[PDB]
Amino acid sequence: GGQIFHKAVLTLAGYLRSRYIEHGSLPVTISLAFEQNYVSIEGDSAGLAELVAALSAIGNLPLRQDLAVTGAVDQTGKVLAVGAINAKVEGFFRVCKALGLSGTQGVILPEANLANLTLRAEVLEAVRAGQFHIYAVETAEQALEILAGARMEGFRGLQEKIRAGLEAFARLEEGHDKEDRE
């Protein structure tokens, strides 16, 4: 874990603690893991990815695996710029092309990195052909909406599902306490 990478995790913890307050301390323990990594993570670029993964785990939201997610995020919940955006976008494009492009794969990246998107010729051709998409977001809510494919606002929304999952976990904890007492 990078020295900066520690800050990203704490920032996500703060955002989740302050954003979802219908109980006391957040009633959920989220374990975040880069599977099969076996090497240090240094940047905070994982902040958006970790945030959307944690939100999906809380709300049982099936995120699209078509889309890669990059971008730092502050505890306000707003996606911040990251470095080496071209490298990450083109690496995910390489992986998608190796496994076969399905016309829906893409990358979710901050709007602050629009000026830093100087993509290769092949990635641009794929985007023009519609075989690859680039999504620019400014808040983590937009990224979660794009991934889970639903709006947070309104009934059956992503925010309502997250609140319901939080209520379920809080009920599990308070029930543990309740039979513990009696």
Add this chain to the structure above:
Amino acid sequence: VSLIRPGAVHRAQGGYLILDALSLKREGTWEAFKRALRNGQVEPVTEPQAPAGLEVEPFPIQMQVILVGTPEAFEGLEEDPAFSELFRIRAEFSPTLPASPENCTALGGWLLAQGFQLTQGGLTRLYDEARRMAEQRDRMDARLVEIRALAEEAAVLGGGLLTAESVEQAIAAREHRSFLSEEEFLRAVQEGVIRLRTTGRAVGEVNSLVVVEAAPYWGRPARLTARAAPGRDHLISIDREAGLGGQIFHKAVLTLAGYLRSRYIEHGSLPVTISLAFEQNYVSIEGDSAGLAELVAALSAIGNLPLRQDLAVTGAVDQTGKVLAVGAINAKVEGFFRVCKALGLSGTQGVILPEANLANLTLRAEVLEAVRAGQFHIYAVETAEQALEILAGARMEGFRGLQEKIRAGLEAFARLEEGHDKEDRE
């Protein structure tokens, strides 16, 4: 006999020998010189490959050694008691002189003796820049060679004459030649890479002012976000817990935690967890200048108070709740002014700084002109409550006050925690 080449102790016999203690310590000659002074005698050094040399009588030492050097070279040299035994008189140079018309005249005479062509305006500008370097309104920097270097640069740009315009040009060129980092930072801010808001209001966000330690003269804002959540009394410094925290900076966070714990007592431990983050910083924070900014951000997060993003906030604060002085205040104020000007001055941007730094506010010409025109404001505060009042634009006292809103937010968070406990039990 004619092959004895005289040295410093021979040429300085009966007079004074001025030596550099950094040079004495660097070349290992210190111990030999110390023995020579104590003996009172020394022989010229002979190459050890000579067969026998001459039976030369040691030369008497009838001089007065005056070692000159920075204090570091001397506390790195006076640990040996033989030093304080031999060099007992300490002639210490004050880094600053009292800024007075007599000292301005003395500086003018010194520069004239150095060979410069001074005008009254040019000398006045050089004296003002000396006070600038001293970072105090009533003290001028005693580093005369730095002033001489600036005078040389002004002479080159002024055609040999030190007019006020030439000195101003020299200072501007000095700033511009080391402005690349600030230019890149401003370009990033304008591009949106480093998200900074200098307009509107935000809850729990404040424009703290930091100093780039890579070159400890460029200040730049770094927006600070505080998020309040019910539960543990912990005041989490996201910056410090993730490294990126000065040894002094940890004191500021603990001091804020103590002030918040002791100030708001209507429940037990403070029912809120505040997470403070210098976001998009990615570098160590060393000073406690963030104390006022962190405190006002935390108070706004607790009370849901939308702070003005127009105003940057700098200043340390003790757990009594009083704003203390900070260093490099000019750098921070001018850096925030630079950022505001890059994004376009709106006539309401400004900086909140301690009253204790009034004597340290030697602002640039452009910042002063903006302040006079009303396009930039400087707010001097002595308590964190004053800073919060200025930011949130409301008074602590009275109904619908800032303090009442903070108390209501604390009640709400405590109610959330106790309801969690209540549904935990039943």
Add this chain to the structure above:
Amino acid sequence: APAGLEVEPFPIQMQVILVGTPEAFEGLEEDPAFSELFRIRAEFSPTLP
């Protein structure tokens, strides 16, 4: 060498222009005599518009 020549020191009538990456200079400017001698800093922007 036994004694060499009693050579007069050669005057320095030049302008030294030290060129290097910033790391080599913050690793070199910590000595105050450097900033006393080399006072003009010609810094190269890593990118052009």
Add this chain to the structure above:
Amino acid sequence: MRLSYEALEWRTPIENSTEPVSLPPPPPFFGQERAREALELAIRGGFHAYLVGPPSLGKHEALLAYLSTQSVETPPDLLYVPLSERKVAVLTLPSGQE
């Protein structure tokens, strides 16, 4: 409180920036009475002193300028005289006799 421009105007005003100045040279260690007094004490007592201070204060040059104005008694002429082809000793003579 909102600081006015007058409360922030720190620069000493200029009125004639085109008038050349003619000022007498200041005494050595001007504004540095502590160091000057310490050096005076070291000179009277023949002690070994040491000058300390932040770098670039001009300590080395002001020291030389101050010492040049001083006047010590005529130092005796010290010279090396060979007592033999192998032994050379130090000889002290009145000034101007060597």
Add this chain to the structure above:
Amino acid sequence: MRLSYEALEWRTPIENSTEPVSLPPPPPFFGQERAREALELAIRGGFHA
């Protein structure tokens, strides 16, 4: 938002890739006016840059 190809097309368009160019040499320190001005000041003043 889904970025279109136009919003991502950063490359400056080519229209005649077979036409040789004939351009005058640029001034030294082109795009580096800071370094050039610093060197000019050092040259006028005889400073060590």
